[PDB]
Amino acid sequence: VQLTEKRMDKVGKYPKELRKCCEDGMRENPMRFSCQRRTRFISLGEACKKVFLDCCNYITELRRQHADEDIIAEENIVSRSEFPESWLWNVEDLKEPPKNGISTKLMNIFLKDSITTWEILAVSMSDKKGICVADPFEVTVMQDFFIDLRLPYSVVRNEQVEIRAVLYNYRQNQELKVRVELLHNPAFCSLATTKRRHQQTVTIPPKSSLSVPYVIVPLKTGLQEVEVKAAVYHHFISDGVRKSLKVVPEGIRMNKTVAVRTLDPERLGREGVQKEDIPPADLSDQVPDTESETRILLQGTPVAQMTEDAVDAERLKHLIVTPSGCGEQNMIGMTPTVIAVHYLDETEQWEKFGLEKRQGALELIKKGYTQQLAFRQPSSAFAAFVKRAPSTWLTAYVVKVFSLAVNLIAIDSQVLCGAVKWLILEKQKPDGVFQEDAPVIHQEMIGGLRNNNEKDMALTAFVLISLQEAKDICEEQVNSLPGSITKAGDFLEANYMNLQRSYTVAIAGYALAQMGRLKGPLLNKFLTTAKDKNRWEDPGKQLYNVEATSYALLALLQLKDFDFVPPVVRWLNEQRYYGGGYGSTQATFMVFQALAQYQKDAPDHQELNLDVSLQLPSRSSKITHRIHWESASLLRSEETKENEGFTVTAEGKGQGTLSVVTMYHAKAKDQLTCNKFDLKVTIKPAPETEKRPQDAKNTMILEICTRYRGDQDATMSILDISMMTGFAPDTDDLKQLANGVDRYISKYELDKAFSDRNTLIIYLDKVSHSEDDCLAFKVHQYFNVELIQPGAVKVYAYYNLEESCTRFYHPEKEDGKLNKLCRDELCRCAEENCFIQKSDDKVTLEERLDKACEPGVDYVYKTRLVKVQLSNDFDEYIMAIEQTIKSGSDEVQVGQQRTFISPIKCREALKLEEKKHYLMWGLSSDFWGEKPNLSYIIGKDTWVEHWPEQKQCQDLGAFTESMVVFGCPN
Amino acid sequence: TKEGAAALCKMKHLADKVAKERSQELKDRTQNFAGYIEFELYRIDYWLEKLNGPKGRKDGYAKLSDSDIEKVKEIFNKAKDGITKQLPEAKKAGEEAGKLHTEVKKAAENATSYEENYDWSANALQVALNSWEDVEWQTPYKETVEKLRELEDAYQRGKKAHDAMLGYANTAYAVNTKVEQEKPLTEVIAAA
Amino acid sequence: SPMYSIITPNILRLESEETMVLEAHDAQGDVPVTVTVHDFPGKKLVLSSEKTVLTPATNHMGNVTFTIPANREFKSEKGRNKFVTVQATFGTQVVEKVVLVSLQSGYLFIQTDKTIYTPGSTVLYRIFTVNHKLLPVGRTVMVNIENPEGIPVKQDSLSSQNQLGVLPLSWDIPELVNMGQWKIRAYYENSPQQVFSTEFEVKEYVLPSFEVIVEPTEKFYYIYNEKGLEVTITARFLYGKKVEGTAFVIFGIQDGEQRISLPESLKRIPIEDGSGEVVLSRKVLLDGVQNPRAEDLVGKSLYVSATVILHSGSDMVQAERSGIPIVTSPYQIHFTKTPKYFKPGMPFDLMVFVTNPDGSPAYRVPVAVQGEDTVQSLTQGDGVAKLSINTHPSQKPLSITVRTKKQELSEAEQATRTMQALPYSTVGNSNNYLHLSVLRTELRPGETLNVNFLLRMDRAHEAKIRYYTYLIMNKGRLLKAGRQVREPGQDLVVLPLSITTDFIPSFRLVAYYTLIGASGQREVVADSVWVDVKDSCVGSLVVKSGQSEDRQPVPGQQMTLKIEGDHGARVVLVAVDKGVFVLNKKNKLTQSKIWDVVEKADIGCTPGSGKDYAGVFSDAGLTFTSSSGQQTAQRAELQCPQP
């Protein structure tokens, strides 16, 4: 009783310092973790934990003894911030014949479609008189009748959604009679029919809202329009609503890379000709009735696509396939564009590409700097997240980027020089090794006691590389930079020999070459360690090997050794796996910079004179492309809508790239085996006593735990949860988790729409390997939907996308109630497309014979059901063929089993039972692919009849007798 | 015999390497101690000044307990006093090394084997190589080894001074980033 | 015994029109005069010699107008502020005076769309450039937008040439950007030492479901009110329906910047039909704070925080009311516009500005002088009331006390105020005094004003004085000057002055005279008075609705608006939401704010008369100098003396 009063009284004690801990302890943890368990997550000192434990124990005991609304009054009050956007922003001059100084002018404004009181402010600026201000003018606009149709974000194909419309009346002491109707649309099955229109009368009482529900069954994919009309009696009102909804296929959209090849007819090719074969993609899990698309891209130069994408703001974010919300990823705006600009400034390509885009690129860089300023701390240090401990690595990276960008844009000298001073004086140790006092991000962690020095060497090399750039910018401000540089270089040179990891060797060698100390035996270490004179690779790492190779390439370019460089360029080019490029930001930036540096510092100019011939197997005419240096655009594209392998011929001169990428829809299935993760997702009901919001209809609890499968993870793992149709997450729980003292998560975005379905991305600082890191939260369902399909959850690391896994979760049900929104007609609208509708339960022999023999009919099989497999999206029937009446294009022997795929909604339509004879016949479109034992998809044109092994028996036997009398002569 | 010619070529190559590589490098590594000791003394003085200075808000030092401030100031003053005495030893050593390097360079200017480049050692091998070789240009070679050993001793003096300075240099930097976090008097004084 | 005198403003501004007054006494025939300006250390002849004839037909009065061109400073690093010598040769003798000079001339007004913004929204702002006379001027300006931490984010340089001052500007807020009170600075290239700045706040995205309003029944809480503070709370939706549920209310005391929450002021109230009442008793308020004295807590404010929870839904909304100043007297008496110096024997007038605790002027509140019980001067609409008293002949400091006597209020609740003043010393000890009296009315442009001149001195020599010289100061410049003739035997004189638009927003009249003097040294006696005029636009600007009054406009329908303004005027329009405008109270760009800014920069800083003959001129912003020893002290400070 009076739990809030007790909580307030207990919080009254303790000073203003140790009161946040107690207040957080008062809050109920979303998960079922004990107070002792929760105290482990406290990052404050040893005094906050004691108060937190005391308050947790006290409140737990008090509530247990007690076992009204128990909510603590907020101390930091918040007010409404979102307001209607201002308009009428224009300037006009009064030019009319004055009358004793008065000059009238008539305006023509258009009031916005909203119900609010607007205020118009007028300020005049005369010459003889001066500035003056008039009083505001109030304009009030309101309506008596309002309609609002509520629809979900997206609906899966072949679903049962119950859309609704809300009617609002703003009259007092007067009810409103209205008639509401929904217009028929052939795309989806509705209550209204073509012959009969659905209309209904409703009375809205004064000062109240009324709900009108509706049910629609979507059939066709794409974008559909739903329009509702309302007519008011006794008053001339003809208002209505029209809203667009999205219907998506039943599956997950996945775009996959097919091939990535390097074109160089002279060197790589033989006799000045190169022939390359691109095999067909492996679309073995394509969802039925879905279209795939293949794209072929020819790049004249290895750095054309990135250079063109960086300048454009629209395509800037497409260079990566990962979210960018934190500190380092926010640099995506600055690092690429700058490089591109530089690559265009030194080389004579601006004229061809276009000079006018340079100003836009500078504006993008300015906006990137403005966004980056958000992460600055008062100590001139940048942290991974807002209000967190500063990190040396991020600070050094930001310093380097700002030093590079100072020439192009106006970078404040104060911030850069202060960051340099903080890096030098504070973090650097007397010995000359930079220390880190923040969680590791880029796998710089120590690998052990023997590998402890490796972390120090790597961090020192990176910080030295960053600092060397910021040498001539402000050297008078910081007079201790040369000494720190010399000490770091001496330390790096001292222990360069005792290096095992390829990345550390490469970075140290690059730093020493930049200083100019990589001579003698040290150099022998850098060149010899390379494998096949081509790459710097280590087992188990994919996206870090490319970065190490880029560092080695930069070191080689610095050393002025162009004999060993060309081989590495080919390997670097053929490292595009994710989509059509590199996923990780760091790897992409390093590859871009290395390739740009190689192109800029070229002893000879390799003019582009590429001639490419493509001869698709389906297409008859051949396609020819001619890529030349004078061409304004060095990028060619081709699109096809068929899975096939094709040959390409390249002749001429120059080094180019050819990328073939396929896009298709994949089926929903749990990953066979995770790489280095173990994900588990569970969605369960919730107690009915929970106070759901006004609009929500149901509530559930979703848990999503995981554990690393290695020595340790660190890094920054990101979880992605694909929400469902209608279901939405609870922001209160996420806010409590993120802003609470026991911080379970780093940050949640919940503000992206990259995928068709709603998504929630959670950023995690680390994943425990010894134990299992877990988190649960509540979700609410607003709309009433049936036959809902499962969602998905993906767990992956950022810098290494290969280590990832996926899981699927479905709302718990398991009930043969086959709940369906239909009452009497709507399912009859649904089963029409399922399969050919027989004219009668048992049609006559003549009709059956006439319908059996048609030009489109190719196969007629009499079979016996073997097994039926339950599922969620598509039902499967393992069937064995007993007798053959008419063989189709494919040849099948007697006794060979061919599986059958049917839609879920047809489960109660076909009415197929195991171990029963049946007859059927369909069209050639039922064949799916060409895999051995091809599956038969039951389409609309697929006749099926029961075959008995007693009037019905006599009639069916008489019908059977006439089926094999003739082999369908006509 | 060709062995004598090979030995002569090896000795010439070693002498050239010492004259052009070791001599120049050695001098540049002797004048850096003075520039580092003074820099670290200045940084320590700046850190002390920032502590309880004309203003506050110096990260965690602002809320630091009154008792801990006295100990921090005492240890900073002790380190500053200890580190000062090392300056003259490096200052004199720098000029001595410079003069000796100039003399050695002047002396050097006054005055088969390729497969042996794996040796990569030119520290004190000149006198010994001449020793095996024996078993107008010969006279200057006698004092080169003595001058090189004297330079090595002079550099060793500065190296020892710098290494000794580290003992007092490291303690101040430790307590700095120790108190810089949320570390209370306990651990601090315990380690001090 | 001819005399020649010259009067100039204390501070002369560069690139501005300045005027100097020349007068001669006891002169026969034409009196040519040549005025020149030179640099303080050296001679540069910054201005050509200006010659004017003080013919007897003009009663030996004239003026010279000039503007000092902007030239390279002679002593900028060698001195703090530059001085300029101005000399005048009337006849055989010459006069000279040193004057301080400044370059700052002009103002920049920044108008913003809203005060609260969210990430992704666009900020639209304008800048208006005006000159000393509040007229458009073409000059280069530089504008910077800076984040709260002090790191500029945007910089631009614009020019108002070929435009009527308006400089439209827009900016885009990044999605992920610093949150705080961002600043926008703007200043001229010529004078970077003066900067005009505005501020705007950016907040997170928030949208409440239902509106809750909590307000007290009284604007202020009286100390001895045993009833306590009563607060009413209402909660309603945006579509009309009320809110029913339960609310938690907590009171607290805010002082300076800190706030203390009373632990025994938490109450739970059931809100039915969107209404609820709470009461904070005197006993709880007194016992909450250790301070036992009830008079000591005067000054602190009271705030209330309320939270509302519905019955069916789980939606919550929080509301707070901050303010409610604690005052022991509703009305307050202030001594601001009244002179602080009294002339012995002469009647003394005082001005009292009765104001409400919030700050608004009072209306219908009687006030009187304690001890004398004089006529209760009812407060006017502007809030200023004038009270007259008779001074004593003794040469002692004067003390006055004033109190309000509003009806149906207790004696204790009545406010009180005290004031002290020092006597005005006479140079010759002749008890010569001049009094300028103005009938205080609601004067506005287009209304004559009568000024009464009174003279007090011995009867031995009264025929010598036959005229008075008066000058008017408005916005620093000498707006007008003239003479008033007095016939022998008439002690009191009347001067009708026409009030025009130039006198806005106020003016100061300084009137003086001179006489031969029995001792032998010419004596000068001066007096000053200040008058305020209603603040209003020079022209007019009206925004009416041209559409006929048929029915309230519906959304999406086209309508018409009638804009009436001065001929050839550039009109700027903007449509802002009512809620945002009402929520904003400090950055409103009103005519009153502009006039306050204009009046703030005034060379003269004094309510009324000074202490000596030179004191009056110095306080009024004039410098009186002549050939004889009579001279005023120089000014070596641009700003007025600090309190």
Numbering used by the authors:
A (entry chain B): 673 to 739, 752 to 1633, 1643 to 1663
B (entry chain C): 35 to 145, 203 to 226, 256 to 312
C (entry chain A): 23 to 665
According to the publication:
We show that only convertases of the AP but not of the CP/LP can form on the surface of T. b. gambiense and that ISG65 is capable of specifically inhibiting the activity of the AP C5 convertase in vitro. ISG65 adopts a three-helix bundle fold (Helix 1, Lys36-Lys84; Helix 2, Asp100-Asn144; Helix 4, Thr259-Glu300) with a 20° curvature along its longest axis. The TED of C3 is the main site of interaction with ISG65, whereby its helix bundle follows the curvature of the globular TED.
The ISG65:C3 complex could be reconstructed to a reported FSC0.143 of 3.58 Å, while ISG65:C3b was reconstructed to FSC0.143 of 3.59 Å. For ISG65:C3, the local resolution predominantly ranges from 3 to 5 Å, with lower resolutions in the disordered head region of ISG65, the flexible C345c domain, and glycans in the two glycosylation sites. With the exception of the disordered regions Ala666-Ser672, Arg740-Leu751 and Glu1634-Asn1642, C3 was well-resolved and could be modelled in its entirety. Three hydrogen bonds are mediated by Tyr293 (Tyr293ISG65-Glu1110C3, Tyr293ISG65-Glu1111C3 and Tyr293ISG65-Glu1119C3) and one by Arg77 (Arg77ISG65- Leu1109C3). The interaction between the proteins is further facilitated by the almost perfect complementary fit between the convex tip of TED and the concave 3-helix bundle of ISG65. Mutation of Tyr293, which is responsible for almost half of all contacts, completely abrogated ISG65 binding to C3d. A second, smaller interface is formed between loops in the membrane-proximal region of ISG65 and the ANA domain in C3. Within the interface, we could identify two possible hydrogen bonds, Lys97ISG65 – Glu689C3 and Glu302ISG65 – Gly717C3. To investigate whether the interface between ANA and ISG65 may be physiologically relevant, we tested the binding of ISG65 to recombinant C3a (the proteolytically liberated ANA domain), which revealed a KD of 18 µM.
